[PDB]
Amino acid sequence: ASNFTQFVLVDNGGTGDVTVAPSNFANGVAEWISSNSRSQAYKVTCSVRQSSAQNRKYTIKVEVPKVATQTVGGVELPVAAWRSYLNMELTIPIFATNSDCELIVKAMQGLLKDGNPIPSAIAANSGIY
Amino acid sequence: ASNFTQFVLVDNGGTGDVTVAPSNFANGVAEWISSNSRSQAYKVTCSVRQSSAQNRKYTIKVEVPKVATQTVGGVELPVAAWRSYLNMELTIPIFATNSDCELIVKAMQGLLKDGNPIPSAIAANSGIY
Amino acid sequence: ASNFTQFVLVDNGGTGDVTVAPSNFANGVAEWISSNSRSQAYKVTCSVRQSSAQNRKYTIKVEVPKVATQTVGGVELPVAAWRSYLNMELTIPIFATNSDCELIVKAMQGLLKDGNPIPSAIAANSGIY
Amino acid sequence: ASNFTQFVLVDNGGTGDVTVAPSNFANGVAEWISSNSRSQAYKVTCSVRQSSAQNRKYTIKVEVPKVATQTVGGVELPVAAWRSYLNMELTIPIFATNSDCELIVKAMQGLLKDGNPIPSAIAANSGIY
Amino acid sequence: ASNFTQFVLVDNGGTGDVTVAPSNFANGVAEWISSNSRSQAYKVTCSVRQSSAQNRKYTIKVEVPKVATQTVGGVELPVAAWRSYLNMELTIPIFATNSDCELIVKAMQGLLKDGNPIPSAIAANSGIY
Amino acid sequence: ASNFTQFVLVDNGGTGDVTVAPSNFANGVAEWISSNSRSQAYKVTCSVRQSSAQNRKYTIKVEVPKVATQTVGGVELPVAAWRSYLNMELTIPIFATNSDCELIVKAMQGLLKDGNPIPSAIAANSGIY
RNA sequence: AUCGCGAUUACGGAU
RNA sequence: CGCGAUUACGG
RNA sequence: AUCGCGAUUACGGAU
RNA sequence: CGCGAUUACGG
């Protein structure tokens, strides 16, 4: 049994989908990378720790690259023109039951559901208004 | 036209749904709160800023409360036994087109889709394994 | 919901009613004004904020024009001689439920109900006696 | 005549109605409180002052209590869990006619009428949007 | 109603028309940008302020970009060769009627109508003579 | 060409049109005024200069009279209560061709076109909401 | 407050 | 910052 | 005098 | 920390 498996990070129908696969799990930090050039790959890392006596804290990170070709001196390399960085920290008290945690996950999914304020602002280079 | 409207943060069928509604938009920080006692309410805040010459940066925050009743000296008040705090920062270069941003949003939605590694770990008080 | 809508501020039973409509939403401060020059308009603004860790506070301001001997659309100076200013601050502890808040609204409606002391004193250029 | 009379502050249809009565006029501040221990009473105060050469200012305050029984030193005392405070100040120019003042009263009544924006927001622990 | 809607900034007869849409209202500054990377977008901002006891001032800004593709560090980025800036400030007395304001709008529209002096000079990289 | 000619500033469809005609050319600053006393006239001035080595800049100023309750030919004080001031500054990089400039003019026409946000806000004594 | 003040444009300068 | 938090504060 | 300043609310703070 | 980032680094 494992949850350290590959999964679909970006879903575009059943083709053009971005899949990220396990790559490293050193020092309590799980890492997933999409295939092909590491330079143009999507990256996801995750870890958990006892931040304090009563809290556990997750640290999730995602990197979305802008695939491009670099040319210098006639030598072209596969690179990322730039990257978007997502850093999130989730703090959960040790009193949270599995039911409480499921609620916390639904809250995160709802926050980003299509059509809702926040994902709509981001997807349009906008802020709130 | 506005995206500063109320929306469903937690979806439980069509009943028991947690709705969060606009409450304040001071100093570039949009805030949403669920109804009833502010003390037991869900909170969501969001803001955007030009973090540097080439980047814009979103700061999203969510608070999930554990509803409980406090009793002291025979006086009972509606409170939150504790809260989960979600803090996320999304950095996006100014070269990102609307298409690039839509991709960034699909990445975030995919990261948290039911069944995927990360949301499954959280929902089970677990880490990666 | 979306409660930022036009409403009747001064009710004269259909004929001579003063309607006030949304006119600004800068900084989360909602504003409504009558169809007049801003020097002679009825103005209403409302905002909410967490005044402290234990309280939330609504700040409601109203501006009412002096109508007797008024010259519609004219320049009337000094400004202070032709306008009345209402300034309300409602502090509500974060423990107040919707029910508690409904009762608070009723208390305000009762305070200003027709025939009661306060409104009768104001309407007659009087004090309490 | 004398406008210093009792009135019903909170109307719950002649059953559980909070009526408030005259209780003090010391120092030019008219006071009304409900039939309770001074520690659990609803309180209303009003005072008028010639705040300037050409202005008159009414200062009105209402206190809505959340009644409770507290056990202090092993003994039960009637007390208030918390209180909600309404502080309003109305500045009216001395040139205001009686009919000009009636206009101000109607505006305040219309402002808080059931179904209108502001009372709706307050009653729902919400902001205007 | 709500006047914060999208509109066509540059009209090229429904084909290559530059339409601009709401994107931010943080800090009381209404913003509109076109569907482009933030680095190549048309931008329009507007804000109203009570610049004095008896004045209201609208501050409006428009940014027209000259789009281009630039090769930085051997990589292609969507950028703007240069930008044209329009900064306008309109000061209107509070005694201005709605019809007085309509008069101001018509003057501004007449000012820039095709064939009139000013737009003719600007369009021809010329001065008035 | 010679574009320093009389033109219609306020179009009321033939009847009640406000025409503005050349009235001064001192210092290369072109001026146009309506047929009124200078205290009640519509005034337009326009000039161009090389603001810097990289830019040219047009400075356009408009003065519009408050017409409601106006006394034609009378002495109306204070001046600030009876006049609105438009102040436009258009900066254009020296690389802008006539085509680029034509587009810049269209952007200005679109900004003020009837029915769009900005002109509707101004005409209704409002802000953005 | 004003500037036929500047800008890389919600910033800076001068009186 | 896989820094802490009473969560738009603090290191 | 003003504050979308605070409160334990006829008191206190700031400009 | 609505601190910045070349993103498990740094303030």
Contacts of D9 (CB under 8 A, 6+ apart): C107, C110, C111, D18, D19, D20, D32, D34, D42, D44, D62
Collect all residues from B whose CB is shorter than 8 A from any CB in C. 5-6, 21, 23-26, 35-39, 77-79
B45 touches strand H (CB under 7 A): yes
Q: Tokens standing for D81?
A: 């869990």
Name the closest nucleotide to A59, judged by C1' and CA.
H2
The closest CB to that of B10, out of A42, A88, A110, belongs to A110
What is the separation, in whole angstroms, between the first and last Cα of chain E?
45
- Between CA B55 and C1' J9 the distance (Å) reads 18
Q: How far is CA C112 from CA B120, C11, C119, D16, D102, in A?
A: 56, 14, 6, 19, 12
d(CA A91, CA A54): 10
Task: Give which of F118, D52, C44, B18 is closest to E48, Cα–Cα.
Answer: F118
Edge-to-edge strand order for the sheet containing D30-33? C7-10, C18-24, C30-33, C43-49, C55-65, C83-93, D75-93, D55-72, D43-52, D30-33, D18-24, D7-10
Residue in B91, B80, B87 with CA at minimum distance from that of residue B38: B80
Residues of E in contact with F27 (CB under 8 A): none
Compute the distance between CA of residue C66 and CA of residue B39 in angstroms, rounded to an integer. Answer: 43
d(CA A60, CA A65) in angstroms, rounded, equals: 17
Interface residues of A toward E, Cβ cutoff 8 Å, are 68-72, 79, 81, 124-129
Question: What single DSSP character describes residue B64?
Answer: E
Q: How far apart are CA D19 and CA C117, in angstroms?
A: 13
- Establish whether the CB of B46 is closer than 7 Å to any nucleic acid atom in strand H: yes
Q: How many CB atoms neighbour CB D55 within 10 A?
A: 18
CATH number, domain of D10, equals: 3.30.380.10
* Count of residues in chain A: 129
Nearest CB neighbour to D126, from listed B21, B73, B74: B21
Contact E95 C75 (CB under 8 A): yes
> Which residue in this structure is represented by tokens 């977008």?
E41
Beta-sheet strands, E only, within chain E: 7-10, 18-24, 30-33, 43-52, 55-72, 75-93
Q: Which residues of A touch E75 (CB under 8 A)?
A: 68-70, 79, 81
Whole-angstrom distance, CA of residue C126 vs CA of residue B27: 42
* β-bridge partners, D62: D44, D86
Could you count the other beta carbons within 10 Å of the beta carbon of residue E105? 21
Nucleotides of I under 7 A from a protein CB: 1-10
Neighbouring subunits of F (3+ Cβ pairs under 8 A): C, E
Count of Cβ atoms closer than 10 Å to residue F118 Cβ:
24
Q: Which residue of E has its CA nearest to B101?
A: E37
Q: Which nucleotide is nearest to F47 (CA to C1')?
A: G4
Which residues neighbour E118 within 8 Å (Cβ) at sequence distance 6 or greater?
E111, E112, E128, F44, F46, F60
Sign of CA dihedral D32, D35, D36, D42: negative
User: For chain A, how big is the Rg over CA atoms in Å?
Assistant: 18
Q: Chain E residues with CB inside 8 Å of C22's CB?
A: 1-2
Enumerate the H helices of B1-129 as residue ranges: 98-111, 117-122
Handedness of CA C120, C126, C128, D2 (dihedral sign): negative
Q: Show the CA angle centred on residue C6, arms to residues B31 and F81, nearest 5°.
A: 95
On chain F, the residues whose CB falls within 8 A of the CB of C36 are 125
Residues 6+ apart with CB under 8 A from F99: none
Q: Please, are residues D9 and C111 in contact by the beta-carbon 8 Å criterion?
A: yes
Q: What's the domain count of chain D?
A: 1
Q: Could you give the residue ranges of the DSSP H alpha helices within D7-97?
A: none
Residue partners of B86: CB distance under 8 A and separation at least 6: A88, A89, A90, A91, A104, A107, A108, B60, B61, B62, B63, B64
Whether residue F66 contacts residue E83, with contact meaning beta carbons closer than 8 Å, is answered with: no
F122 CB-contact burial (10 Å; exposed 0-12 / middle 13-18 / buried 19+): buried
Q: Is the CB of F55 under 7 A from strand G?
A: yes
Query: Rounded to 5 degrees, what angle do the CA atoms B92, B64, B79 make?
Result: 145
CB-based contacts of B72: which residues, under 8 Å, 6+ apart?
none
Are F81 and C75 in contact (CB < 8 Å)? yes
Q: Tell me the C-alpha distance between A46 and A65, whole Å.
A: 18
For residue C31, the one-letter residue type is E
Query: What totals of helices (H) and strands (E) does chain D contain, helices first?
Result: 2, 6
CB atoms within 10 A of CB F37: 12
Q: How many CA atoms lie within 13 A of F32 on its CB side?
A: 26
| Nearest Cα residue to B48 out of D127, A29, C96, E33 | E33
CA distance F37 to chain E (A): 18
- Evaluate whether D91 touches D56 at the Cβ level (below 8 Å): yes
Which residue has tokens 């677990």?
B126
Q: C-alpha distances in angstroms, B18 versus A119, B109, C84, C97, D122?
A: 18, 19, 42, 16, 19
> Whose structure tokens read 């590694």?
B117
Q: How many CB atoms lie within 10 A of CB D113?
A: 14
Give E-chain residues touching A70 at CB under 8 angstroms: 73-75
Burial of residue C16 (number of CB atoms within 10 Å: 0-12, 13-18, 19+): exposed
Å separating the CA of residue E101 from the C1' of nucleotide I11: 46
Which among F83, F89, F12 is positioned nearest to F43, based on CA atoms?
A: F83
> Can you give the distance from the CA of residue B34 to the C1' of nucleotide I3 in angstroms?
30
List, as one string, the DSSP characters of A64-129. Answer: EEEEEEEEETTEEEEEEEEEEEEEEEEEEETT--HHHHHHHHHHHHHHTSTTSHHHHHHTTT----
Q: How far apart are CA E83 and CA E89, in angstroms?
A: 20
Domain hosting residue D100, numbered range? 1-129
Question: Which tokens go with D97?
Answer: 């006619």
CA pair distance D25, D32, nearest whole angstrom: 9
Using only the alpha carbons of chain B, give its radius of gyration. Answer: 18
Q: Which of the 8 DSSP states describes residue C129?
A: -
Measure the CA–CA gap between F34 and F120, rounded to whole angstroms: 25
CA distance E35 to E41: 7
The reply to whether E24 Cβ lies less than 7 angstroms from strand G is no
Please name every residue paired with F58 in a beta bridge, in sequence order, or none if there are none.
Answer: F48, F90
Residue bearing tokens 């890492």: A31
What is the full DSSP assignment across F13-66? TTTT-EEEEEEE-GGG-EEEE-SS-TTT--EEEEEEE--SSSEEEEEEEEEEE-
Near-strand I residues (CB closer than 7 A): B 26; C 29, 45-47, 49, 51-52, 54-55, 57, 59-61, 85, 87, 89, 91; D 27, 29, 45-47, 51-52, 55, 59-61, 63, 83, 85, 87, 91
CA-to-C1' span, E50 to G1 (A): 13
**Dist CA A32 CA A26 (whole Å):** 12
Measured distance CA(E44)–CA(E5) in Å, rounded: 12
CA dist list (Å): A7 to A74, A115, B117, B123, D129:
37, 24, 8, 17, 40
Distance, in Å, from the CA atom of B83 to the CA atom of B63, rounded to the nearest integer, reads: 6
Q: Is A100 exposed, middle or buried (0-12, 13-18, 19+ CB in 10 A)?
A: middle
Residue B23: which of C48, C96, C98 has the nearest Cβ?
C48
Relative to beta strand C30-33, strand C18-24 is antiparallel
Whether the Cβ atoms of residue F10 and residue F44 lie closer than 8 Å to each other = no
Minimal C-alpha gap between F126 and chain E (Å):
8
Residues forming a β-bridge with B44: B32, B62
Instruction: Test B4 with D129 for CB contact under 8 angstroms.
Output: yes
* Residue B14 DSSP code: T
Give the span between the Cα atoms of B75 and D68, in whole angstroms.
6
Residue of E nearest to F79 (CA): E93
CB of B23 within 7 Å of some strand J atom? no
Q: Which of D115, C4, A123 is nearest to B6 (CA)?
A: C4
Structure tokens at F15: 């009847």
Asked if F128 CB < 7 A from strand G, the reply is no
Phi-psi sector, A27: left (phi>0), alpha (psi -120 to 50), beta: left
DSSP C16-37: T-EEEEEEE-GGG-EEEE-SS-
CB E92 within 8 A of CB E108: no
Spatial neighbors of B1 by CB under 8 A, at least 6 apart, are A129, E2, E4, E5, E6, E21, E22
Sign of the dihedral defined by the CA atoms of residues A35, A36, A37, A39, in that order: negative
Place of tokens 């007049």: C36
User: Residue D98: enclosing H or E segment and its boundaries?
Assistant: helix D98-111
Calculate the CA B66 to chain-centre distance. Answer: 15
State the nearest Cα–Cα gap between E77 and chain B, in angstroms. 7
Contact E89, E76 (CB under 8 A): no
Task: Please report the resolution in angstroms.
Answer: 2.6
Location of structure tokens 């587009």? F103
